[PDB]
Design an enzyme around this catalytic site. Structure first.
Site, mmCIF file in Angstrom:
data_model
loop_
_atom_site.group_PDB
_atom_site.id
_atom_site.type_symbol
_atom_site.label_atom_id
_atom_site.label_comp_id
_atom_site.label_asym_id
_atom_site.label_seq_id
_atom_site.Cartn_x
_atom_site.Cartn_y
_atom_site.Cartn_z
ATOM 1 N N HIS A 77 28.057 19.833 32.689
ATOM 2 C CA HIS A 77 26.779 20.497 32.454
ATOM 3 C C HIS A 77 26.525 20.504 30.957
ATOM 4 C CE1 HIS A 77 23.607 23.619 33.145
ATOM 5 N NE2 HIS A 77 23.944 23.928 31.910
ATOM 6 N N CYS A 78 25.833 19.482 30.464
ATOM 7 C CA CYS A 78 25.589 19.389 29.034
ATOM 8 C C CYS A 78 24.634 20.497 28.624
ATOM 9 C CB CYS A 78 25.030 18.022 28.671
ATOM 10 S SG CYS A 78 24.614 17.820 26.924
ATOM 11 N N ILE A 79 25.090 21.350 27.705
ATOM 12 C CA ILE A 79 24.314 22.507 27.274
ATOM 13 C C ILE A 79 23.179 22.089 26.357
ATOM 14 C CG2 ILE A 79 24.463 24.768 26.243
ATOM 15 C CD1 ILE A 79 27.716 23.305 27.017
ATOM 16 N N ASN B 23 21.187 20.174 30.977
ATOM 17 C CA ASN B 23 21.110 19.594 32.309
ATOM 18 C C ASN B 23 22.490 19.125 32.729
ATOM 19 O OD1 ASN B 23 19.049 19.537 34.124
ATOM 20 N ND2 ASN B 23 18.555 17.382 33.810
#
Ligand SMILES: [Zn+2]
Ligand SMILES: [Zn+2]
Lengths: 222, 276
Positions: free
Chosen positions: B128-130, B134
């Protein structure tokens, strides 16, 4: 040593009500008369409607031991639920016989792993339908080093992110032919004059049902 | 939020380069028009692909597709809890395992996972790339990689542009401070995208998504120099080249979430059917 494949959607229960006597109460029975849930509540209908009380769903599961591509791309089992190598076998054989009753709605279930779909389709017909939809899914997803995917990715990498987002859809019509192909095939199997249609069974697009099970909405069995 | 930080870091060097420098490189001989054009093109690529990755579909699966029973307030049966082991082809010598996510109530396909933030089950979950804000799934992994590559290339081109500018000005660094600022900012934003890109190349060199890597790290807590190779990869293909090609260039496939008609058309895939 290889673990045998089985219909992993079905679960069993022992506290149920036998059929034949109106005064059946929930009791514990021998395993040979253990209840096996086979048809499930209709997820594809709005609650409280009519078809939710008229229909039950039967899932043809996802398989993995058939093709080299069964891990990357979905591929469904080509057998009727009840004939898997690790399915429960009863005395009636391959047909579906009402044995007991279970959850709300007083739904009837058989004490084997056979499915009420056996009342409508046959092994050969199910194999044909499932094989066609398998092929359609495979040619829809496509190969990694194929021109469809590689051209898409190359022009995408060239224009940043825009060709698949905004600029592409405006320009080319017939590159989306496989989605509508699978849609037409399923809608034709469903439409009047079709194998599934005549028998009273409706199929749903694997695009709607997340492509993680091949569902057949059948009339709520009695 | 945290995505606005990266959006400012992406739009800032354009302004600082188009207000102060992109006039003494057209007709001054302190630079090359080809270099100016390439910098603007790569910057447009980076911004467009970052917007795309931040507003794209990671490949989420519908919910409640596998319900079991309407009793006990939609209680999950016993046989759904434990794992299920299924056989693969005759070639691959290892069986596969499959699990039942009790939040979305679907039988997870292989290599899918659950995001505790967005509360959906992504198809080939990476992390979950902050910053992008997304989940980097299967249908936007290519966009994430295009973003990292565009960032590297834009930084390098801005670096060489500012270098050829500072090297050819006669009045000394006492008349172009903004070039030195841009040089430092480029040299600082060239590192972290390069580190992320090399980490992802080494991951995808053994058919391992970041989630799988950090899972298989086991009891050792060294996320840098772990042996990226394993011997039980069902999804192995044979070599570093083919592994990269099958993980990064994967086909997107159809999109499973769409056509939201909340006025009771296509229900049971939006109703909060949690046990409470
Ligand atoms: Zn989930
Ligand atoms: Zn997420």
């Amino acid at each position: 040593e290889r673990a045998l494949f089985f219909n992993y959607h079905e679960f069993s229960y022992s506290f149920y009500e036998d059929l034949g006597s109106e005064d059946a109460k929930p009791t514990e029975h021998d395993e040979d008369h253990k209840l096996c849930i086979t048809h499930f509540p209709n997820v594809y209908a709005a609650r409280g409607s009519a078809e939710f009380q008229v229909t039950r769903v039967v899932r043809v599961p996802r398989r993995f031991d058939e093709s080299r591509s069964s891990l990357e791309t979905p591929q469904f089992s080509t057998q009727l639920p009840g004939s898997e190598p690790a399915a429960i076998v009863g005395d009636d054989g391959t047909s579906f016989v009402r044995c007991g009753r279970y959850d709300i709605g007083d739904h009837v279930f058989g004490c084997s792993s056979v499915s009420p779909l056996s009342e409508y389709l046959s092994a050969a017909e199910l194999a044909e339908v499932v094989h066609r939809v398998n092929g359609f899914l495979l040619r829809e997803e496509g190969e990694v080093f194929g021109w469809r995917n590689l051209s898409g990715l190359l022009l995408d990498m060239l224009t940043g992110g825009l060709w698949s987002w905004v600029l592409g859809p405006l320009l080319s019509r017939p590159v989306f032919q496989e989605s509508l192909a699978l849609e037409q095939y399923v809608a034709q199997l469903n439409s009047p004059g079709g194998l599934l249609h005549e028998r009273g069974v409706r199929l749903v697009l694997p695009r709607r049902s997340g492509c993680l099970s091949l569902d057949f909405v059948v009339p709520r069995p009695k | 939020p945290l995505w606005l930080g990266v959006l400012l870091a992406i739009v800032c060097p354009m302004v600082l380069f188009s207000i102060f420098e992109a006039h003494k490189l057209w007709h001054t001989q302190n630079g090359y028009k080809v270099l100016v054009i390439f910098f603007y093109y790569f910057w447009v690529i980076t911004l467009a692909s970052f917007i795309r990755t931040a507003t794209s579909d990671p490949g989420v699966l519908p919910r409640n597709i596998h319900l079991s029973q309407l009793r006990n307030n939609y209680q999950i049966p016993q046989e759904y809890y434990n794992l299920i082991t299924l056989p693969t082809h005759s070639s691959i010598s290892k069986d596969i395992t499959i699990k039942y996510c009790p939040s979305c109530r679907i039988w997870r396909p292989p290599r899918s996972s659950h995001c505790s933030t967005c509360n959906v089950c992504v198809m080939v979950h990476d992390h979950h790339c902050i910053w992008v804000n997304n989940c980097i799934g299967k249908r936007n992994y290519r966009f994430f990689l295009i973003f990292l590559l565009g960032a590297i290339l834009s930084s390098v081109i801005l670096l060489t542009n500012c270098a050829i500018h500072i090297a050819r000005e006669s009045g000394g660094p006492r008349d172009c401070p903004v070039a030195i600022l841009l040089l430092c900012y480029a040299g600082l934003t060239l590192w972290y995208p390069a580190i992320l890109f090399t980490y992802h190349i080494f991951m995808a060199g053994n058919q391992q998504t970041t989630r799988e890597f950090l899972k298989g790290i086991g009891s050792k807590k060294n996320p840098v120099f772990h042996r990226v190779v394993k011997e039980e990869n069902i999804y192995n293909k044979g070599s570093f080249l083919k592994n990269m090609g099958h993980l990064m260039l994967e086909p997107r496939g159809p999109s499973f979430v769409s056509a939201r008609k909340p006025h009771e058309a296509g229900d049971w895939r939006f109703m909060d059917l949690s046990p409470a």
